[PDB]
Amino acid sequence: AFELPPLPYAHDALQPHISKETLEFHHDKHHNTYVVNLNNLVPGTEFEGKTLEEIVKTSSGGIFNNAAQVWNHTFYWNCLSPNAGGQPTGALADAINAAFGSFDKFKEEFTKTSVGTFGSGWGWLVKKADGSLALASTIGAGCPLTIGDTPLLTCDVWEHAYYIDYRNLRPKYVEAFWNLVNWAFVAEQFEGKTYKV
């Protein structure tokens, strides 16, 4: 059955941008719940052998909400890391600077897309089927995988992602998340070995 992927870093590794408490709750409880619920939902269905990506790509209803949320969260943890942040270099940086004009202007628009997500949702930086870059905002457990797009970066805006550390100040959370982005991971997604399982 599906399993909860260990955190790619220590629980206190992302301080002081995201507390250890936030990670314990967000990863140990919330993420875990989605995993548990997915494992209770797949038995006896046509999703019994499929892979996470496979399920979120063909499922709907409650199976989807949980499957997509598990993936979204695993992907999300990888988009972050200690001693990171900064900017992307190489082809990624060119794709961004060419699609958004500059990295600072990409952050501006990525921030607007995230913060402007009404309610529970996610902010995304994706690569379309034509290799072009694009921003997307999903609500709930919405995942770019279902539109054939390729996720390069994501930002969880569900209130539990930041309430402990920023309360209602969602913008201050997004701003501090920039200091944790794992551009190496984003780059890998951009063009190379895309994240799976």
- Judged by CB under 5 A, the residue of 80, 156, 166, 182 near Fe ion is 156
Which tokens sit at 123?
């902010």
DSSP 175-190: HHHGGGB-HHHHHHHH
73 is in an annotated binding site: yes
Q: With CB cut-offs between 5 and 8 Å by kind, which of its own copies, Fe ion, none does residue 2 bind?
A: none
Specify whether the CB–CB gap between 154 and 75 falls below 8 A.
yes
Q: For residues 87 and 120, which CB has a smaller minimum distance to Fe ion in the complex?
A: 120
Q: Should residue 25 be labelled a site residue for its own copies when binding is judged by CB under 8 A?
A: yes
* # residues contacting its own copies (CB under 8 A): 19
Q: Should residue 158 be labelled a site residue for its own copies when binding is judged by CB under 8 A?
A: yes
Residue 163, C-beta contacts closer than 8 angstroms, at least 6 positions apart:
none
The binding track of 70-109 with respect to its own copies, each residue x by CB under 8 A or -, is: ----------------------------------------
- Judged by CB under 5 A, the residue of 158, 162, 173, 177 near Fe ion is 158
Specify whether the CB–CB gap between 95 and 190 falls below 8 A.
yes
Query: Rounded to whole angstroms, how far apart are CA atoms 130 and 196?
Result: 21
Helix axes of 170-177 and 103-115: crossing angle, nearest 10 degrees: 140
Q: Should residue 119 be labelled a site residue for its own copies when binding is judged by CB under 8 A?
A: yes
11 is in an annotated binding site: no
Start-end of H helices in 9-162: 20-23, 32-41, 52-58, 61-78, 90-100, 103-115
Q: Should residue 43 be labelled a site residue for its own copies when binding is judged by CB under 8 A?
A: no
Q: Minimal distance in Å, beta carbon 27 to Fe ion?
A: 9
Site for its own copies, rule CB under 8 A: 25, 29-30, 33, 65, 118-121, 139-141, 158-160, 163-164, 167-168
Site for Fe ion, rule CB under 5 A: 156, 158, 161
